[PDB]
Ligand binder design. Sequence first.
Ligand code: ZN
Ligand code: ZN
Lengths: 80, 67, 153
Amino acid sequence: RPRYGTLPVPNRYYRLMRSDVSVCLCNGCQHFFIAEDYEAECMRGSGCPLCRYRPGKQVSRSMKQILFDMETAAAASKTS
Amino acid sequence: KDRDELLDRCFRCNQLIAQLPMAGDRCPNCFHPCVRSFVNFECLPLVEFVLADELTDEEAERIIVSG
Amino acid sequence: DMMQWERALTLAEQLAPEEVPIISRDYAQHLEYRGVYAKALEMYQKGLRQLPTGHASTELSVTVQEVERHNEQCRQGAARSQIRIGNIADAMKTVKESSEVSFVKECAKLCEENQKHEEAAQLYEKAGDIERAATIYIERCKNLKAAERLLPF
Ligand SMILES: [Zn+2]
Ligand SMILES: [Zn+2]
């Protein structure tokens, strides 16, 4: 399902015939990856290597993290 | 003499890719675009098929769930 | 940007078959400003294009309106150009099958100069104004039978 936004774009369909290869699809990006390779690349602390999608949380994050980051920046300014 | 293990395989035409692919990274034989991974860029065993005009994506999901 | 639309078409024969008519229409537009549009008919006839066949999604749906608008504009240009050639009878079907008031008004002006007063009379009453139509009737056409129907108005 091409996530271009709210625009109507038809869903493309693919057939898999050789089950010995593990494939996955990053929901934030909708690009195909090798599942183990995508999992290994996700550990670099930026989610999907392309779209930086992180599962387990909705599209709108907890933006209070930015407020705590600015708090920590002020703290590092006021260390010395 | 090129090795066959490092050559891309087009699963739609069931034939290897020896020549340089054309624009769109399509198959030289059957013009099929390569369904590639986006870490190592390996042609995954996936073929692309579009529904007929009498079927829709909602109907495709309905018939996928039903049978 | 060279305005050598002839060689643009020539290379578009093998490069981009679909781009062929559009440039063509633009060519005719420039001829519109110089009065040399006597050759500006064959590209309008070549502007036809087969319908996009495919799935019934929006992608095959939106483009239909744009390509049909291009066809309507091309037929408008063809009807405008056919007046001075002397093919009023062929253009009359397209004009009377149209709806646009301004296009019919612009087409109606030039029919009198070719002494084709019947088609001019047909277009004047549907041009949106009856006072000027009757003024042309009594001064040039002198056709009282058509003016009788316009007497109460
Ligand atoms: Zn992704
Ligand atoms: Zn192939």
